Every structure is written in structure tokens, then in C-alpha cells.
Amino acid sequence: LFKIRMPETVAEGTRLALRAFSLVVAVDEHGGIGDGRSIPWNVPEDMKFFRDLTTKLRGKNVKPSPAKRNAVVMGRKTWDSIPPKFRPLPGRLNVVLSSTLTTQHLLDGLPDEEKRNLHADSIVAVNGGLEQALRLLASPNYTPSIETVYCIGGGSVYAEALRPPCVHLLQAIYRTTIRASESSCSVFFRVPESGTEAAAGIEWQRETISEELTSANGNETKYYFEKLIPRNREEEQYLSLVDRIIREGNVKHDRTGVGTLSIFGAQMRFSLRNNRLPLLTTKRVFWRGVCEELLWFLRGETYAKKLSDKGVHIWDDNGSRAFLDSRGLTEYEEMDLGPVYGFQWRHFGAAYTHHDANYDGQGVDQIKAIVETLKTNPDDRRMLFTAWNPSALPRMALPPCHLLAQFYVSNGELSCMLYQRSCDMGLGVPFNIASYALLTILIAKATGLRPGELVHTLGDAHVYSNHVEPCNEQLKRVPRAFPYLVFRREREFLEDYEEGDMEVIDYAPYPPI
Amino acid sequence: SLFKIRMPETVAEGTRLALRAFSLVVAVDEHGGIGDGRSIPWNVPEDMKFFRDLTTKLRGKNVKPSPAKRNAVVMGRKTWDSIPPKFRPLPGRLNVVLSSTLTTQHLLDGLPDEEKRNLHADSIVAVNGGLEQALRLLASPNYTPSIETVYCIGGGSVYAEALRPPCVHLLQAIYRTTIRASESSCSVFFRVPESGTEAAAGIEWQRETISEELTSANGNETKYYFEKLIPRNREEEQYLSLVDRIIREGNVKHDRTGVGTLSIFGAQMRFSLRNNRLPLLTTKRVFWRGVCEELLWFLRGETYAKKLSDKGVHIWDDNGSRAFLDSRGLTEYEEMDLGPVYGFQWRHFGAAYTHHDANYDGQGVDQIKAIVETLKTNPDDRRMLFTAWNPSALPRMALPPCHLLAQFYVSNGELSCMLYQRSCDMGLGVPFNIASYALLTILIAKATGLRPGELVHTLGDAHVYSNHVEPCNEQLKRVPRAFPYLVFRREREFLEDYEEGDMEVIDYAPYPPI
Ligand SMILES: NC(=O)C1=CN([C@@H]2O[C@H](COP(=O)(O)OP(=O)(O)OC[C@H]3O[C@@H](n4cnc5c(N)ncnc54)[C@H](OP(=O)(O)O)[C@@H]3O)[C@@H](O)[C@H]2O)C=CC1
Ligand SMILES: NC(=O)C1=CN([C@@H]2O[C@H](COP(=O)(O)OP(=O)(O)OC[C@H]3O[C@@H](n4cnc5c(N)ncnc54)[C@H](OP(=O)(O)O)[C@@H]3O)[C@@H](O)[C@H]2O)C=CC1
Ligand SMILES: CC1(C)N=C(N)N=C(N)N1OCCCOc1cccc(Cl)c1Cl
Ligand SMILES: CC1(C)N=C(N)N=C(N)N1OCCCOc1cccc(Cl)c1Cl
């Protein structure tokens, strides 16, 4: 009615084409991985590392299961190299690439029968390459049930993962180096030199490298582990700005003595193409809160309790009876924030009485109008909305911070720019980037467009003196690949979307600082 | 009175020009020699002529020098001495002589006859100091803006002072004639510092022009050539390269009209407003007078475009005409009555609108006044911004705001400003917008005891019109020159009372029409 009806192109725009994945490999001092039939060395330490890496789930105490586990992709020749007693690999979805062998054909080559019924759901053959597997793994019954997809081998498989379109989906490369006294390899693994067309535009950098370890294989073979990740220039934008703000920002102390380092005016860009979701990796982002709050904004809500009831307490300090009163909002029921954010978005200028009254047709519905223009006249330059209403400011628990957004369209993609007057680089900005990335994504799905990019304009960009110590540490971390957002379900109206309708996959942020 | 914004006692001390900008003319041989300490070792009539025309002529055409409008030349006392009394002072120019031994009267007494010193009294002034003191004198009201361009004309000591801070930062151009002198044996030299060296002080001298090798009719067939160097203007380059990127990578788009553009989404540029600098682009003259009249017009919260048209500023005629207004369904508006646009929102945000001449005193939110007050008591407040983008009022506006948001920031007594423009015509709009908001920051600063800092410009739909691509590509050939400056010849009791004539842009030398 006064809600926004999603078109019939809802799911296509954000349908995941290929699932992201990681790569594991052991290599000798020459890049050798095998002679074509087997691995010419025996370092049990690497075997354990491989077992644990591809088996373990990130969550604490979560044991693999059809509901939640990792998958492993391997060339058919690699499947045959594994002794039948060790097949299929336990706790992981075994995926085999074969133009001939079928799923059951693999189940038959196993010793037991009272076992093949257990592995029925643990093995799958794909008549195609890694790409074909990545597409199969991206479908609904594998995503997000499968937490991480690991390419575990086959010279040809590694080779395919290192060329487009697969390399663009490689989140990390775990490479073990074995200083073997022997050199009997004919199948290798090499990462294209930077700048080369073979590199694709990716620059692999070391996140970690172990000390030189000595194997207990009887030969004291020397080896070491190493982790490579694709340079995330977008997150680097953010780290660079924080660092600049800390090293050259103006120093100020407010009426309480609260210190800040700041600059005025900055801009960042983030891609939202192909399901990409710019959730910073150097410090985990409270995605569940971001999502619940945005949906909350879009519905034009003003009652913070709906948030705190879901475990999202970001608005508690500003919706308390105490804070409301310090604002002169003595008559607002507690947690009633007044005509903030979402209300102005959907009912700009309308008079406010109390949260959750019906406001149909009151004020200007900026979001609805932009939905219409985006669909009929995409070149329009008036497609923006604001929560900055000087007339209503006094009635707000707080004045809007991210206060303006403008949309733009080119090549069938929706782009958005956010204007933020005050930016806490440490605790706010990452949250804000997430919030508006999602907004652009949702608006794109509601207008038959595809997610383009988020442009973030910052006014007062700052770092609180306190946060300086923590931030300097976070700045040492090399950013990781960004995660992806998928929709497990769609809705008839934009206002009916729920946090559970969507899921962030392949998000592997660094631990707390 | 209370509806207006009263200027403080510091209104003039803050935008007060400390030093006047200048240019430098010099003739050096191939080893950087300029003289033996007493005179110039060579005789090249053509250079003497170049010097004469360059320092005497005023910009434009058929404008002869006059006491109320001419250039000035600054020279050391030894250079003044080297000129034969029969040529002193240099006609058509204010001759400024640096000296700690001779007064202005002593300079006059040193002239040949009385008929010469009597007439030539308003053409000579001696300053008891160096080039810097001279530039400060020149910055005073009786010399600025009356003096169009200041030229440093010599004395090794003077050239040296012009090439080191604080003076080099005010050096807008270097006109250097190189004499290919057969034999050279000077004792006084000159030489510009290379890019990247400390002595250059971050300045990257660019060669705007260089003549072909010329032969002097001095009798010795002496070879010589001319050069004009300019301090690289990175700021204007932000704009040129953005235009160039739009043309090469921009997406094609069309207006409701059907007119095509090339555009990119989201960009940002910065401009310093320190020491009276005003970012008026040089690769294409900007209509300053219209910029100023309109900006003041916004500040008063005006909505009647005829106030501008009656001042030879017709930038609003096309959108305030009976025809355009009817096309917008605003038939109850008298012609040129734009509706609650721009300034109306700035000073009376949210106020109901009827007609441009109704009394709106105290109606709606006066965002400008509120910001001026926070700026003077709580400078680090992070909510200092105003907006003309009022969803409620849009339908009643001739057209929705382009530059729709502005936020201020303070640091070290300096005022910075951030403009947010949703749509940006790079060719004809953007240069104008940068100028107006640079002006705004300066006026707000003057109104709050602050000094102009920086202007940050955020661009939304940044585009170049199809019918401008070619002419723009051309403009892109030009190497931008140094920006001009802004000075106020007088002040006002209230912000709303300032007039375009209260201020003047000086040392603005844009390239001629493409
Ligand atoms: N050092 C290490 O960490 C590792 C080393 N290895 C070593 O690597 C060597 C194996 O490498 P390699 O010969 O490349 O073999 P792979 O293990 O990659 O197997 C290749 C086979 O996978 C299938 N396949 C690959 N691409 C496709 C496709 N696009 N469509 C259909 N089927 C496809 C084919 O099966 P089919 O023939 O049925 O059509 C194919 O012949 C061995 O020596 C093994 O020991 C293996 C893993 C790890
Ligand atoms: N090639 C060219 O284009 C030019 C060459 N020349 C050559 O340059 C040589 C002259 O150079 P140079 O000896 O450096 O002389 P200058 O022409 O620079 O004169 C220096 C004199 O100017 C005055 N002065 C300079 N700075 C100050 C100050 N800070 N405070 C007070 N007075 C100051 C002093 O006057 P006082 O002593 O009275 O106190 C001083 O001795 C000559 O040979 C002349 O021919 C000159 C102009 C141009
Ligand atoms: C593990 C190993 C080399 N080590 C690392 N670091 N990465 C891999 N991808 N590997 O290869 C896994 C495929 C080959 O697996 C086997 C080959 C022979 C016996 C057994 Cl039990 C297994 Cl699992
Ligand atoms: C002129 C000259 C070198 N030429 C150029 N291009 N630049 C200068 N700065 N000059 O020096 C001017 C100071 C000395 O001027 C004279 C010296 C002797 C006689 C006469 Cl009539 C004059 Cl104006």
C-alpha cells in the first residue's frame, strides 16, 4: 500500500554465480607437487596441518555435519591417489572432478557397504572443472551450509583456480614448502608473477609464514608453512585514512576532555558487484546489528526497543529515560527516539506523536519516490534522500550522523554515495559502510538493477585519542578478502525483509585486538 | 537588527592582505650572470623594449596607465642608481625603490631638473626595507587594488629575496630573458631553484612559453630568447584531470531535455583559502561579478531573481520566466519569483512560502545565523551545517538545489567548508560553484573571528555536456596559472549588507577565450 513492492526480478540481480574458495598445497623447493601419480615426500606435519585446516570450522566447538562443514574439491587423479581406507576425507564434503566417474561410481570403489550409506551425502562428482564445482557449491543446498570451500589439489585444478574466472574468487592460498633432498616432480604449482596478465590484477602478499620446522619423519626434513592473500585495496583505503588521521590530524579536546585526532573531508569507494560485501576484515563488524538496524530504518521505525529486543543495543544509551530527558524529551516513552533517521526517510516533515502510530501519507516518502524514479528515469540527478530536517532536529533523541544519500545508475548498476558529517573511524565508519552497502543492495533488488558501488564521503573524520593504541595495532594487519552477501529468500515488500532472509558468507575477520 | 547577522570587531582583521602578490622580470646570461655589481654587461635593445612593454602595459586593450590604475616596479637602490637620471623614473609605473639610506625626497632631489621632479612625485616612493616590506606597503588600501600588477625588476639582492620564503609564495610568474652572450663575466647572479630542491620550497616552476631564438640588432648579432615560467597550480589540475577523466571514461547520459552528457559518479577536490587566495580558475575566466552578486543574494535569503537581473546578472532569467514557471505549475508566482529556493531555506528553512515580497522575518529555521553562533562559541561542534534540500518545499521551487549542503569545521583559528553538489556541470557550473562557496567561507570567517582555511568540494553526478567535449579538450591544453586573491576595501555592520563593490579580486590573469 504505502509499502514498496519488489519487482519480479528480485533474486536474479543478486544470485550468486560462483562460490568463493581457498587453496591448500604442499610444494618442494622447485614448486613440485607430484610426479603425476603421487607425492614424492612424506611429511606427517603437513598432513596434520592439511587435515585440521580443511576440516575445522571457525565457530567455537562446532563439529562438522551436513548442516555445517567445509567442502574439498579435487581432481579425479587426486581422488585415486588417496588410499581407499582414507576415502572419502572425513568431516568434509568430498567433491571430485571427473568427466567419466559418477557419484555412485566413487561410492563403489570403497571397502565397506555398511559405510557407503553414511558417505552417500558426503561425496559428489562434477562432470566439469573447478568453475563448474564453484557454481554447484554456490547453489542453495550448499550455500551457506558449506562454510569454506578448499581446492585441495590436482595440478590441473590448481591451474584452473589460478586463472580467471576462478582467481577472482580465491580468498587465500595456504602453501607448505618442503625442502626435499629429492627432486622427482613433473607436476607443479606456480603463482603468476605480479603485473603479468597471468596475475589477473591480483597481488598476493604474505599474511603469515612459520619458522623453519623440522619433520619427525626420520629424515629431519625441513619445511615451513605460508599463507598468501589477495591485496584488498578497498580496505587499505580505510587503513590509510585512519593512519593519516592519526599522524597528521588536528588535536582537540571537548568539554569533557575527550581527545580526538581529525581531518575534514575524505572519500572512499567500495565495490558491491558480484555479491561482494565490504565488511572490514582487520576488525570484525557487528553485521547482525547493521542489518537489523537498516531494515529498521527502511520501515521508518523510531522505537529502539525493537532493536534491543533482538540483542542490538547500539541505541540504548541514547534512548534511556535519562538521556531522553537531558534532551527535553520528557514526554517520550523510554526508547522512543523521536522522528529520527528512518522516519524522515519515509515521512520527511510529518508531525511526530509517538513511536508506532500510523503515519500513512504523512510527510514525504523519499525512499518510495527514489524507487519509482530509479525504475523510470535512471539518469535523473535528483535521486537522494535526507534525514537532516532542521525543523525536526529538536524533537530527535539525536541529530542524524549519516544524513544524506544519493543514487546513480550506469550500465544497469546502482551506485550510492553517503554523506556523513561526523565519522568515528574506529567504531562507526566500518558499521556505516556496511549499513549503506546493504541499503544500495536492497534498493537495487527493488528496482531491477544490480549492485554497483558505494561512495563514502566523510566530513569530520576522526580517531579518539583513546583508540589510538588499539588502532596502531590494527594498522599492522594486512587486510583480507571481503565476504559476500546472499539472499536465501525474497519478500513481496521491501519492508518485510528480515535479517534471517540474508547471510554473509566467507567472512574471516581477524581476532580481537 | 536581530534578524541580521552583526559582524564582529575583527571583521577586517582576518582577511587583511599581509603581502601583495607580484611577478618577476629578469635578464640573465647563460651562466646566470645579471651584472658586474654596477651595471649590466650587455646591450640588447630588444630586451629593454620587452621589459618596457611588459611592466608598463595593463591587461586588456586600449587601457593606458594612470595614477589610479597602473603597475608598480620594485628595485634595489643600486639598480635605481644604474638608470641614467634622464630615464628616471620609469614612466607609466609606480617606481618603488628599496633603500635604508635614501628617502623619497632624496630620490627626487637626485633628478636632473625641476620640471622632472615636480611632475614625477606620485611616481616614486622609497621603502626603508627589503622586498617583503615593499610588498606589505603595496598591500595597503591606497596601492591595492589600484596597482594592477607588481613587478620585481632587479638587483641581485632583490631577486634573491623574491626567490625565498615568504616572498616566493607570492611570486605568480617569472619572465626571464636569456642572453647568449659570447663572453660573460658577471659578479651578481640569478637562478631559479629546480623542482624538488629545498630552495624551491615545494614550488614546481612550469614553462608556459618560450620564444624562438632571436638575433639582436645590437651590432654583434647577439642571440637571445624569452621565457615565462609559472608556479604549477595543482589545485586547478584537480579540475582539469577530472574533466579529462569524464571525457575518456564517463558514461553517456541524457537529461529530460534529451541533451547528452558524459559523467562519473562521486569525486572530491580541495582548495586553500589561506592568505586571501581565491580559487578562480585561470584556464577559462570565471564570471566573478555574477558569482558575488548571487552569493550575497543567497545570504539575504532572497527569492526574487529580478534583483539580480537588474544588476546585469541574468543567470536566473531562464528559470524565473513566466514560461518556465508555468511549465513547473507555479502559475501563482509573479515572473522572476523562484519560490522558496536556496537562500530562503538557508535563512528560513521550513517556512511556508507565498510570494517573494512577503515578510519572512523570524519564520523557519535560520541555519546561517545558528552556524555563525556555534562557530563563535563551540567551534569544534560536529553539527555545523546548513541545507537547502527540503523535500517538503521542493515542489514549490523553480528548481531543486544543486549545491544543497554545506558543513563547516574549525582548526587553528581557520575555517574550512565542505560543499555537497548533487549535479555538476564541469564546463560552466563547477568553476562558478567553487568561487561562490570560497566566497561564502570567507564571509562566514569574517563574521566569526576566524581566518579562511579550505574549501572541500564533493561532486555527485559530475558531467561534461556533449556540446562541450571539443571546447573542453582545447582548454585542457592550457597550463593553469597562479590563482588570484580577494580583498575588501570596506566592511559592513551586517553580513546581509555587503555589496559586490565592497570587495575586489586582484592579480587574476586568466587565459583568453578559447
Ligand atoms: N603437493 C600437493 O599438495 C598435491 C599434489 N597432488 C599431485 O598432483 C598430481 C595430480 O595432478 P594432475 O595430473 O593435474 O591431476 P588432478 O588430480 O588434477 O586430476 C585431473 C583429473 O581431474 C578431472 N578434471 C580436471 N579438470 C576437469 C574438467 N574441466 N572437466 C572434467 N574433469 C576435469 C579429470 O578426470 P577424468 O580423467 O576422470 O576425466 C582429470 O583427468 C599427482 O601426482 C598428485 O599426487 C595432488 C594434490 C595435492
Ligand atoms: N640582469 C637584470 O635583469 C638586472 C641586473 N641588475 C644588475 O644587478 C646589479 C645590482 O645588484 P645588487 O648589488 O644586488 O643591488 P640591488 O639592485 O639589489 O640593490 C641593493 C640595495 O637595495 C637596498 N636593499 C635591498 N634589500 C634591502 C633591505 N632588506 N633593507 C633595506 N634596503 C635593502 C639597499 O639600499 P641601500 O644601500 O641604499 O640601503 C641595497 O644596498 C647591477 O650590476 C645591476 O646592473 C639589476 C636589475 C636587473
Ligand atoms: C596433504 C597435502 C599434500 N598438503 C597440503 N598442504 N595441501 C594439500 N592440498 N595436500 O594434498 C591433499 C590431496 C592429497 O591427499 C592425500 C594423498 C595421499 C594420502 C592421503 Cl591420506 C591424502 Cl589426504
Ligand atoms: C632591463 C632588464 C635588464 N631587462 C629585463 N628583462 N628585466 C629586468 N629586470 N631588467 O632590469 C631593469 C633594471 C635596470 O634597468 C635599466 C638599466 C639601465 C638603463 C635603463 Cl633605461 C634601465 Cl630600465
Ligand SMILES: O=c1ccn([C@H]2C[C@H](O)[C@@H](COP(=O)(O)O)O2)c(=O)[nH]1
Ligand atoms: O552512524 C554513525 C553515528 C555516529 N558516529 C560517531 C561520530 C562521533 O564520534 C559520535 C557522534 O557525536 P557527534 O558528532 O554528534 O558530536 O558518533 C559514526 O561514526 N557513525
Ligand SMILES: O=c1ccn([C@H]2C[C@H](O)[C@@H](COP(=O)(O)O)O2)c(=O)[nH]1
Ligand atoms: O550551481 C549549479 C547549478 C546547476 N548546475 C548544473 C548541473 C546540471 O547540469 C544542470 C541542472 O540539472 P539537473 O541536475 O537538475 O537535472 O545545471 C551546476 O553545475 N551548478
